Design a protein around this ligand. Structure first.
Ligand SMILES: CC[C@@H](c1cccc(C2CC2)n1)N1C(=O)[C@@](C)(CC(=O)O)C[C@H](c2cccc(Cl)c2)[C@H]1c1ccc(Cl)cc1
Length: 89
């Protein structure tokens, strides 16, 4: 399925994603996917976009991902949407 190795991937977020990350404390320009996933996860919970569907129709997350919603259990799909907003190091 999804390898644990993916969490070690080094990435450089594009401007829009970087802006979202910085709203939950992100201080850097290069991150590990583990960091990106956590910061996104915290952005999601603190904004009560989730409580298995995440609703992001009127949130920058929705513009970032290109969807009005998505399931938190569909990890492969989530990884794809995230990569649309970053560059691998
Ligand atoms: C929506 C809450 C959030 C969440 C909240 C707080 C901390 C974390 C840390 C795991 C990063 N995640 N979260 C979860 O709570 C999980 C358990 C949902 C699940 O499968 O039941 C896992 C989920 C995840 C983890 C790793 C890779 C992918 Cl693609 C998805 C993860 C998540 C979901 C969506 C995004 Cl965009 C980013 C991270």
């Amino acid at each position: 399925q999804i390898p644990a190795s993916e969490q070690e991937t080094l990435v450089r977020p594009k401007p829009l994603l970087l802006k979202l990350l910085k709203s939950v404390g992100a201080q850097k320009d290069t991150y590990t996917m583990k960091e990106v996933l956590f910061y996104l996860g915290q952005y999601i919970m603190t904004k009560r976009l989730y409580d298995h569907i995440v609703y992001c129709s009127n949130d920058l997350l929705g513009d970032l991902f290109g969807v009005p919603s998505f399931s938190v259990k569909e990890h492969r799909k989530i990884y794809t949407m995230i990569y649309r907003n970053l560059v691998v190091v």
